[PDB]
Design a protein around this ligand. Structure first.
Ligand code: PSB
Ligand code: PSB
Ligand code: PSB
Ligand code: PSB
Ligand code: PSB
Ligand code: PSB
Ligand code: PSB
Ligand code: PSB
Lengths: 121, 121, 121, 121, 121, 121, 121, 121
């Protein structure tokens, strides 16, 4: 089963980071969420109730990304995957990628970040 | 067998969406289609009749994307995969990705969408 | 005097537009603001009090772009130029460009919009 | 008076070109239109009737770009400027830029084209 | 063994295509080549003779892409994979992707093309 | 008279540069040419003989950019402007911009270069 | 005289900013420098000694951008323009644009900054 | 286990290359590093000590990329993978991609390079 529902390049201004100054100034966090969902019923029915609402997922990601500042991207993604898996039984597995395009790293790069994959139990 | 025929970033202005206002205003839909096709005969012969015509595939996608408005991206992709699989026996499997880069979601992101993979029976 | 202070590609999700459906769904508005300001004193002093604060300007633009929905981009830009000119005497003239990259126009384009230039009286 | 109304990166697939093969195959034409229009009344009133409708302008450009094939970009732009100037008295001057990003020129470049500026008489 | 040597976005102006007009006018062909090669010896030695020369590979691709016009992308890629596999025993497998970003297809898309994977016998 | 004919982002691999190593290795040179030409006759007539051929201009630029290596970008642009002005009486003035996106400068930048404007005598 | 020598998109990681946290964490500063220089002698001679060395200019910009942290972009640009004007008599005027693409401003934008133009006395 | 920590598009100006002239002039090297690391503990704890520090990894890559010039990209990547695997036991495997976007290859392409994957022993 290779069907997926995705939300790409979601950007949020947040205050996460292990560094005091980061928590103070903040920065933009980029988030990609890919959900493993069987979409054949919805493909047949065309009834919005047979699939997972992208809009609702964005709201969940947003509430976590624009909420309380935490130290790690690992913790933010764990909370997002866990939030999506908990509320949608149709999601067989959740992939969350978070990128800091402008972290406190003296250099020239496109971004740094993490990616996790959590199956829905 | 890892050979594929692809059509990337096809853009169509359509009226699909579960929201009345979407159906009224419309938006641009981005579509990626990847077809699993054994291309060694055509690679040998160079005869256009031994492969699947990209132009014809685009026409099929277009007729569906610019046709009657439906609620879901899931339904649009199901119709496209089913249309391609039905008319081309050489296509072993069809992957259809549809992205709404500008859906009615208050936020900053690159796009939202779905992706399905349907083997040709 | 060719010195300027600028804010490029500011993006806001708003509900402006002459069409009911636009007001309902909303869309992203892109805004460029260029201010004619003599920057030699600040270039000499390095004292933030001798120039116009980009951060404060962004806040002004934001309050207007994310506020009450109006029909025209012309009206939004007039309000922004007027807001900036009114609060900063050092701004000799304000240029405001607003782009709707995804208006209700069935077609393929990069964007549509307006640009105004208002001298500070 | 530096106010303008603009339409950027409009893309149309057409068959214009002095070469037979071009007329046969076609290509994408990119068009930028900038109109000199005094926008202060509309900025005051917020009444759509006090400005020039971007949507209507796009329709005009489209009808010319997707219509009968001609030899020159110069002729296409002359027809567009003339069409806009004729129907809108508020347009003091029309600038039309047309780019062939992929003309029959053996080489590597971003595009070739012309730009004209026609005052409204 | 997941090591690879790659050449991305190689662009050549050629005259390939099943349509007479294409052969006459030509267009830009984009080519991506990925070679499966064990790079640990070279990683140890740092001796250029223990790996496959990217420059030589580009020359091979070029000679085929800028040579005699053929009908299919399938045939061009088959010739490239076969050319690389034949001359380099260290290449365990060759992947060739060819994209026509501007084919004679009336529409808006990013590109169309094929991709093949050929193991070296 | 604000009409212009332009060729943007022409790229050529050349060996120009004041440094021996540059002459040996080479690099990509990016060239923009803007010609001041009255395009109203051609806009009226649609006859290719009433304007300046973009294709011919590209050929001229190419012959200079891919020819004998010289030390300066200033000299290359002077030769191009002079070549275009000499062969086309309809060109009232020629602007030539040449960019070295990857010169032997240890740093991070988008490009360095020169731009000249030469009226046709 | 419209000839210019330019350096575009120079990027430096620095610690400038009126905010303590900025000075602590730092960020990338983007700089564009355009110099008004008569390039006809060099265009004639092809002798590097008749023009201004882009490499030397970059070094000057770099020494200022990667040096002591100051509060304002206005001060940094004033120092750069003044440094270039002082060391090169052939530079009739220096334009310096500095952009903070990621300042401590909670929002979505492309960048904020200033631009100054200083004639060489 | 599909969790990863990544650093994308790191750019360094170095002098690596098998050609004398390359070693003399230098060029920009682009590096992507993907680390296979189990991130669930850190996702639970939010304690920076339970994961691998992206900043420290960048420093390692940098020290190798901006250090002594070597002939091959294969050798540079082998040293990086080996450096990361050696210092971090939590890294189960290291993927290093190095791209020369502007090598001494007369042509038009996006880049050439290699990619290696080394499990941590
Ligand atoms: N795995 C992970 N996940 C997160 O969410 C993290 N947040 N930080 C984090 C915490 C504290 C500092 C930094 C940071 O980027 N520091 C950059 C830096 C780190 C280590 C060593 C050097 C540097 S930069 C440097 C080095 C030498 C001189 C001057 C500088 C610039 O400050 C990041 N690391 C994370 N790792
Ligand atoms: N899986 C899927 N597939 C499709 O094809 C869909 N079309 N829509 C769809 C239908 C109705 C509404 C929307 C939509 O994007 N609504 C966005 C939204 C949804 C849910 C909750 C909030 C919001 S936005 C919001 C929230 C609070 C205040 C103000 C707003 C902006 O309207 C999308 N959802 C789909 N899901
Ligand atoms: N100068 C200006 N400023 C603003 O802020 C505006 N907002 N709108 C606005 C208001 C109402 C409708 C639209 C709009 O874009 N409509 C697009 C459209 C307009 C006119 C004619 C045709 C079309 S699209 C079309 C045409 C034929 C068939 C189907 C369609 C798609 O609806 C925009 N126009 C503005 N002009
Ligand atoms: N000012 C202007 N405006 C237009 O609208 C034009 N359409 N064409 C046009 C007409 C006929 C041919 C071409 C074209 O691009 N030909 C390219 C070309 C022209 C002249 C000389 C050489 C070439 S390409 C070439 C050269 C040598 C060998 C092989 C080739 C590839 O065919 C363009 N020129 C225009 N000029
Ligand atoms: N698998 C494959 N590989 C190649 O290398 C190919 N080259 N062509 C090829 C050959 C002949 C024509 C075309 C082409 O793109 N034609 C586009 C087109 C094809 C089929 C049906 C319609 C169209 S476009 C169209 C349709 C209706 C009206 C007007 C038009 C524009 O001409 C491409 N097809 C290939 N397929
Ligand atoms: N106006 C102009 N026009 C041209 O066409 C030029 N070609 N070169 C040119 C000639 C010789 C060297 C270079 C070059 O870019 N050198 C870069 C450099 C120049 C001056 C000072 C330092 C550097 S880089 C540097 C500095 C210190 C240590 C290590 C390095 C890297 O080599 C360029 N300069 C031009 N100027
Ligand atoms: N003209 C100019 N030049 C420079 O070089 C400047 N550096 N700063 C500067 C100094 C201090 C703070 C900031 C900054 O961007 N602050 C952003 C901000 C400023 C003013 C008001 C609000 C904000 S953001 C905000 C607002 C409300 C709640 C939360 C936040 C996020 O901190 C920038 N301003 C400059 N102006
Ligand atoms: N696998 C690998 N890894 C590295 O790190 C390499 N560095 N070089 C390397 C060494 C020496 C030369 C070049 C180079 O790119 N040369 C380009 C070139 C190579 C072979 C054949 C032709 C050419 S370009 C050419 C051809 C004909 C005429 C004129 C030219 C331009 O010089 C690269 N090759 C590598 N391969």
């Amino acid at each position: 089963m290779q069907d997926t529902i995705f939300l790409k390049g979601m950007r949020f201004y947040g205050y996460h980071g292990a560094l005091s100054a980061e928590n103070e100034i903040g920065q933009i966090f980029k988030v990609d969420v890919t959900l493993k969902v069987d979409l054949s019923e919805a493909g047949r029915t065309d009834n919005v109730i047979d699939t997972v609402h992208y809009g609702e997922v964005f709201e969940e990601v947003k509430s976590i990304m624009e909420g309380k500042a935490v130290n790690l991207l690992e913790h933010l993604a764990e909370r997002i995957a866990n939030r999506i898996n908990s509320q949608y039984n149709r999601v067989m597995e959740t992939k969350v990628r978070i990128t800091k395009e402008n972290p406190p790293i003296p250099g020239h790069y496109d971004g740094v970040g993490i990616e996790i994959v959590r199956e829905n139990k």
